TrEMBL record, chain B:
Shown segment, full-protein numbering: 21 to 34 of 69
Ranges annotated as biased composition (Basic residues): 1-8
Provenance organism: Middle East respiratory syndrome-related coronavirus (MERS-CoV)
Name under which the protein is recorded: ORF4b
Length: 425, 11
């Protein structure tokens, strides 16, 4: 019937002034564009069919052609930026927004999907979809007493499209749009569907990836406890965005980091810092590095949760990127910590792995390690135990690495190693 | 001690 048509036949059908022939040809086009192996999007565009599909979007008395054209345009907009642009240039944004309020659920869902693709292209088309007034009708679709009454796929698509409306930077989404979307996002963050939860966490992670004012917008809604609860979820697709959002939040002020701590986040990091997925370990160690850059009481809370041994472990054995995050965490710890906290760090066995890491080729990690060692030596100076620390570093074989770095290409490493050897060795 | 900071086809 409408299977395996040529673009020539599709064009002939769509060009006829017979609405049923147009509908059949549009369905054939939808089936072509819905094929997994190289859908012929460029051929459909060159045939000039986008304006016809956009016009069909407005055929209220023929809902099937509305649906078929919306599906075809969705799949066109799912491609490159040029193909999404071809869809936008045909006037599809206002037509899809008008279809959001369709009495046919599948047509409204298809419009949500298409707008999601368009907005996911980037910040420009995101803001253009916002300017055409999509947020109000999108959120009106979720204005139900209980989200469980909605179809699962419909709700997942709405959540994903909203996440795309929260996505991308330079510029970030308009402040008023974020404020308009956030309450529904909190409500969705309390939903029970794993995919809805994952996409809501991704939206929150987007919204928290920015200056402290954006983070504050998010945290004032009271979402941090729910984010911590989701951080301890079993589904990796949920933990990943939740951990990203928590890390973004702790990149902010000390009070926002403290809101993360008060919600019980640290208690999850024994598992996160040993998680078998390298990405989780890296993100969690980065989050820890940003928590150790906070106040001394926050470093103390890190200590009380028994997380210093886990940082020692990550420093001893992990993917190099995770080890570099751990080096940063140790340097921040030593920069902001008390003398007691630093000697505790040393008692947990940090010196040996911190020195073994000096054999790396990256210069930044070497400089970070040297700064951490300088801070540790300063604490020892205040305790009059610099000779014991020097003996410890010498037994580990770190003095050899430092005297070798004295011949390093970078100026900072050269000077720091020479200063260490002249002041303590 | 300083802080350090898609599309879908319908088949």
């Amino acid at each position: 019937g409408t299977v395996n048509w040529s673009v020539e036949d599709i064009v002939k059908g769509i060009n006829s002034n017979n609405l049923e022939s147009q509908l059949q040809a549009t369905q054939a086009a939808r089936k072509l564009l819905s094929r997994e192996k190289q859908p012929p999007i460029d051929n459909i565009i060159r045939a000039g069919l986008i304006p016809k599909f956009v016009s069909f979007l407005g055929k209220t008395d023929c809902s099937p052609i509305q649906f078929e054209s919306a599906w075809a345009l969705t799949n066109i907009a799912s491609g490159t930026s040029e193909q999404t642009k071809a869809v936008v240039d045909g006037g599809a944004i206002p037509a899809f927004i008008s279809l959001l309020a369709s009495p046919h659920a599948h047509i409204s869902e298809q419009a949500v999907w298409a707008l999601g693709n368009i907005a996911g292209d980037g910040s420009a088309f995101r803001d253009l979809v916002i300017k055409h007034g999509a947020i109000d009708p999108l959120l009106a679709l979720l204005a139900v007493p209980d989200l469980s009454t909605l179809a699962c796929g419909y709700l997942r698509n709405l959540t994903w499209t909203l996440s795309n409306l929260c996505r991308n930077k330079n510029p970030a989404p308009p402040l008023d749009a974020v404020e308009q979307i956030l309450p529904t996002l909190v409500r969705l963050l309390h939903h029970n569907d794993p995919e809805v939860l994952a996409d809501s966490c991704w939206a929150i992670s987007y919204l928290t990836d920015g200056p402290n004012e954006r983070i504050e917008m998010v945290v004032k809604k009271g979402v941090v406890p729910q984010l911590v609860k989701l951080l301890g979820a079993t589904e990796l697709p949920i933990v990943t965005p939740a951990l990203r959002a928590i890390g973004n939040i702790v990149t902010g002020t000390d009070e926002q980091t403290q809101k993360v701590i008060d919600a019980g986040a640290l208690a999850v990091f024994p598992s996160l810092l040993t998680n078998p997925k390298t990405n989780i370990q890296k993100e969690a160690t980065w989050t820890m590095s940003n928590i150790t850059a906070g106040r001394q009481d926050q470093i103390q809370q890190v200590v009380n949760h028994g997380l210093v041994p886990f940082l020692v472990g990550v420093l001893s054995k992990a993917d190099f990127k995770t080890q570099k995050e751990a080096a940063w965490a140790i340097t921040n710890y030593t920069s902001g910590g008390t003398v007691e906290q630093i000697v505790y760090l040393v008692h947990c066995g940090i010196i040996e792995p911190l020195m073994n890491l000096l054999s790396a080729k990256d210069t930044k990690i070497i400089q970070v390690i040297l700064d951490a060692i300088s801070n540790i030596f300063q604490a020892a100076e205040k305790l009059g135990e610099t000779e014991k620390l020097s003996i410890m570093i010498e037994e580990c074989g770190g003095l050899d690495k430092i005297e070798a770095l004295q011949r390093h290409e970078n100026e900072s490493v050269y000077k720091a190693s020479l200063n260490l050897i002249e002041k303590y060795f | 001690a300083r802080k350090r900071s898609t599309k879908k086809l319908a088949y």
